[PDB]
Design an enzyme around this catalytic site. Structure first.
Site, PDB file in Angstrom:
ATOM      1  N   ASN A 157      60.639  21.832   9.192  1.00  0.00           N
ATOM      2  CA  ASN A 157      59.309  21.920   8.595  1.00  0.00           C
ATOM      3  C   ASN A 157      59.373  22.790   7.339  1.00  0.00           C
ATOM      4  O   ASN A 157      60.184  22.512   6.457  1.00  0.00           O
ATOM      5  CB  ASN A 157      58.265  22.431   9.593  1.00  0.00           C
ATOM      6  N   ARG A 194      62.453  18.559  14.242  1.00  0.00           N
ATOM      7  CA  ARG A 194      62.502  18.280  12.816  1.00  0.00           C
ATOM      8  C   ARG A 194      62.445  19.599  12.066  1.00  0.00           C
ATOM      9  O   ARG A 194      61.938  20.599  12.578  1.00  0.00           O
ATOM     10  CB  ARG A 194      61.331  17.401  12.375  1.00  0.00           C
ATOM     11  N   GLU A 231      52.130  18.493   1.399  1.00  0.00           N
ATOM     12  CA  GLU A 231      52.824  19.698   1.863  1.00  0.00           C
ATOM     13  C   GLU A 231      53.886  20.138   0.859  1.00  0.00           C
ATOM     14  O   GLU A 231      54.221  19.422  -0.087  1.00  0.00           O
ATOM     15  CB  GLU A 231      53.496  19.474   3.228  1.00  0.00           C
ATOM     16  N   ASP A 259      49.183  28.129   7.686  1.00  0.00           N
ATOM     17  CA  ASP A 259      50.113  27.033   7.440  1.00  0.00           C
ATOM     18  C   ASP A 259      51.106  27.511   6.378  1.00  0.00           C
ATOM     19  O   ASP A 259      51.908  28.402   6.668  1.00  0.00           O
ATOM     20  CB  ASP A 259      49.327  25.766   7.050  1.00  0.00           C
ATOM     21  N   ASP A 279      56.691  16.386  18.238  1.00  0.00           N
ATOM     22  CA  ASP A 279      55.434  16.294  18.980  1.00  0.00           C
ATOM     23  C   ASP A 279      54.856  17.670  19.289  1.00  0.00           C
ATOM     24  O   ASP A 279      54.275  17.888  20.358  1.00  0.00           O
ATOM     25  CB  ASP A 279      55.635  15.493  20.266  1.00  0.00           C
TER      26      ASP A 279
HETATM   27 MG   LIG Z   1      53.178  23.568   6.665  1.00  0.00          MG
END
Ligand SMILES: [Mg+2]
Ligand SMILES: [Hg+2]
Ligand SMILES: [Hg+2]
Length: 307
Positions: free
Chosen positions: A109, A107, A17, A211, A127
């Site tokens: 990202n 969290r 990532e 994404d 989660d």
């Molecule tokens: Mg990502």
């Protein structure tokens, strides 16, 4: 068609990532969002290194004006890591701010600096789940006096970011929305408004989830398709226009960054993490890093974070 090369030297990642291309040192940095590791690849010298921490990480961006230092995420903290790029642990860690001190299961990202050097990043439940799971994230930027400002809430999985060359637009992905949104971006106030869908996956029979993303010099967005085995090229001049599709062998494509000496080699990360509701058998899900050439476009050097 474009050439898609598996970078054998780099191996397989659980969730590779956050690729970042530092143009002056011709170096790619990236992360694994599950394995708590940072990574460095120098393609011209075939050099690979990694760095271990004990918190979840999601981006790594050089600190403007400070060689050997990086702005990173450590769970919910934005921090400066002093790292020589080769030792298996940081030399030191300087916390800057905890973006969500009282949300114990969130969290950070995806994160990226806008063209002015301001870090933008968003959060998610640790989660989180697709298509449906807990929606607890928000979108932030890190501003003056090391305080964050919030720009959007109700984000399931905070993901890819990009800005138009004229600094009038921002593009943003919540993977759970299965679309890319565009916003009017006010570079003088660092605020966004007039949120609207730019590209909606279901309108174009695109599988999977958006994404990471990046933008090229022509203004086209390149979007990683997690569980779509592809990157897609979409217009920013007109809504809902799919310009091209490039298949990537790994089904779980995670993010993208232009690199190489001429900024025309697209680095692509992917995830080998095998999920229970996958559209792809386990034998297909590996987590390699890829390099795509022959797209006929150039991108921009990765922008450093200014503090
Ligand atoms: Mg990502
Ligand atoms: Hg590091
Ligand atoms: Hg680091």
């Amino acid at each position: 068609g474009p050439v898609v090369e598996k970078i054998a030297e780099l191996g397989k990642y659980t969730v590779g990532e956050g690729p970042h291309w530092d143009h002056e040192t011709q170096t790619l940095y990236f992360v694994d969002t599950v394995e708590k590791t940072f990574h460095k690849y120098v393609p011209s010298q075939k050099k690979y290194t990694f760095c271990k921490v004990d918190k979840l990480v999601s981006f790594i961006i050089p600190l403007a004006g400070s060689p050997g230092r990086f702005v990173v995420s450590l769970e919910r903290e934005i921090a400066i890591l002093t790292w020589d790029g080769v030792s298996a642990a940081p030399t030191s860690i300087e916390a800057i701010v905890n973006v969500e001190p009282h949300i114990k299961n969130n969290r950070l990202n995806d994160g990226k600096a806008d063209p002015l050097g301001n870090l933008w990043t968003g959060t998610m439940a640790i989660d989180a789940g697709l298509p449906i799971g807990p929606v607890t994230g928000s979108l932030y930027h890190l501003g003056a006096d090391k305080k964050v400002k919030m720009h959007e809430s109700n984000i399931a999985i905070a993901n890819g970011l990009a800005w138009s060359n004229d600094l009038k637009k921002m593009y943003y992905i919540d993977s759970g929305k299965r679309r890319v949104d565009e916003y009017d971006y006010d570079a003088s106030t660092l605020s966004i408004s007039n949120q609207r869908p730019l590209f909606t996956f279901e309108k174009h029979e695109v599988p999977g989830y958006p994404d990471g993303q990046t933008i090229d010099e022509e203004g086209n967005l390149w979007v990683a398709v997690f569980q779509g085995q592809r990157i897609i090229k979409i217009s920013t001049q007109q809504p809902e226009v799919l310009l091209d599709t490039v298949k990537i062998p790994d089904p779980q494509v995670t993010s993208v960054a232009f690199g190489g000496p001429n900024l025309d080699e697209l680095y692509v990360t992917s995830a080998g993490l095998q999920l229970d509701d996958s559209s792809f058998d386990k034998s297909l899900v590996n987590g390699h890093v890829y390099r795509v050439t022959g797209l006929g476009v150039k991108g921009f050097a990765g922008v450093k974070v200014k503090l």
